[PDB]
Amino acid sequence: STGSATTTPIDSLDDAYITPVQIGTPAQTLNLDFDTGSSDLWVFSSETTASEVDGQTIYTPSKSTTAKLLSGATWSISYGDGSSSSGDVYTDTVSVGGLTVTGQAVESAKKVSSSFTEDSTIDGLLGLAFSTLNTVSPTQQKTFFDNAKASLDSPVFTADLGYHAPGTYNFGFIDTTAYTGSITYTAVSTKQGFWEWTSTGYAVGSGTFKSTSIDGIADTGTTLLYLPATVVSAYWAQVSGAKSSSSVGGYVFPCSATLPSFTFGVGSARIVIPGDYIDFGPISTGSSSCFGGIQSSAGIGINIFGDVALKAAFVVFNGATTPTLGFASK
Numbered sequence: 001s002t003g004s005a006t007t008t009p010i011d012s013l014d015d016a017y018i019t020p021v022q023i024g025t026p027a028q029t030l031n032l033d034f035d036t037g038s039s040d041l042w043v044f045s046s047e048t049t050a051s052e053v054d055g056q057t058i059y060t061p062s063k064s065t066t067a068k069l070l071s072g073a074t075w076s077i078s079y080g081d082g083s084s085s086s087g088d089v090y091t092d093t094v095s096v097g098g099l100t101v102t103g104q105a106v107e108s109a110k111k112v113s114s115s116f117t118e119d120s121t122i123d124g125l126l127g128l129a130f131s132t133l134n135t136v137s138p139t140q141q142k143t144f145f146d147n148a149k150a151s152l153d154s155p156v157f158t159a160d161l162g163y164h165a166p167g168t169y170n171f172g173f174i175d176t177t178a179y180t181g182s183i184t185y186t187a188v189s190t191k192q193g194f195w196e197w198t199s200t201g202y203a204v205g206s207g208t209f210k211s212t213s214i215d216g217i218a219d220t221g222t223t224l225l226y227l228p229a230t231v232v233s234a235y236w237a238q239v240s241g242a243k244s245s246s247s248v249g250g251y252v253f254p255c256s257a258t259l260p261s262f263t264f265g266v267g268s269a270r271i272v273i274p275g276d277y278i279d280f281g282p283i284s285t286g287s288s289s290c291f292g293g294i295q296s297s298a299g300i301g302i303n304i305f306g307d308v309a310l311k312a313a314f315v316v317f318n319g320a321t322t323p324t325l326g327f328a329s330k
């Protein structure tokens with residue numbers, strides 16, 4: 001079997017992407033954020049404290065005939081954002097772009113952080129990291145991908161995120177028309193439960209490629225690109241007026257500036273991120289200072305290849321026995 005769903009930016013900055021997901025019987029369509037950096041499938045629901053809901057579409061288990069309470073099960077999650085959510089657990093039928101999974105753990109939120117309440121376009125998350133990170137207790141649950149794996153034509157899913165445009169999440173097959181040239185595969189470490197890999201180096205603009213090992217994770221659920229202080233400093237040193245601001249918490253640059261591209265290595269291949277992708281607009285309405293899409297990971301503890309990098313490529317997540325990550329230009 002296979003599945004294919006269109007994913008759409010939530011705003012003109014591509015801060016995040018939402019993908020319609022059908023839950024229950026009859027179907028209840030919610031717009032979820034596909035997150036390869038987490039392993040929980042959670043949604044706003046009829047159980048969420050009324051004051052914490054503001055415009056989101058909610059899942060109503062009582063209206064679904066295939067929903068079943070998972071007695072005693074609970075969940076609690078806190079994101080690198082500081083964001084937090086918690087609640088109880090149901091099992092129900094979930095379909096993504098035609099691909100159906102029965103008995104999928106659907107985590108119903110009772111409490112959500114203000115950050116979530118304020119975000120009316122996101123109805124919940126769909127975790128696509130490894131099941132070892134799932135927070136359901138006392139019985140850990142499997143991810144949607146894990147549950148569909150067997151039925152898939154190939155144990156893979158691909159991410160084709162657009163720049164200021166819709167993209168595609170495919171399950172079970174590789175669209176050979178979606179990319180140019182060849183796909184370069186690279187080893188993945190599952191030790192921490194992430195799609196963790198090692199980049200072979202980088203280049204700024206038309207500069208010399210620097211061969212250096214960069215260990216990080218492929219994370220669709222993170223907007224920006226977080227790299228080591230040394231790499232980030234070398235990038236922004238090429239932008240006049242750019243500086244690290246303590247007040248805004250990161251590198252900012254004069255909106256009138258032209259950003260150089262950034263190249264990251266995948267084995268012997270190279271992926272180029274156009275400079276335009278690295279511009280995240282004014283720090284505040286009317287400001288002439290703009291926010292940079294490449295920031296330091298120093299305080300995070302891990303390098304993150306977020307949307308900024310992923311959207312420059314066609315990305316294959318191969319969930320085979322020996323998982324790999326495939327990168328192609330497009």
Ligand SMILES: CSC[C@H](NC(=O)[C@H](Cc1ccccc1)OC(=O)N1CCC(N)CC1)C(=O)N[C@@H](CC1CCCCC1)[C@@H](O)COc1ccncc1
Nearest residue numbers: 015016035037038079080081083219221222223224280291
């Ligand atoms: C450096 S992890 C911070 C990161 N959250 C972001 O990237 C958010 C995403 C967002 C959400 C809602 C609207 C707009 C953007 O966006 C921004 O933080 N920014 C974009 C706007 C830019 N101008 C301001 C900075 C993060 O927790 N991701 C997790 C998923 C995320 C949680 C919040 C809801 C949406 C999904 C997740 O994958 C983290 O996995 C790991 C985290 C830490 N170790 C390893 C893996």
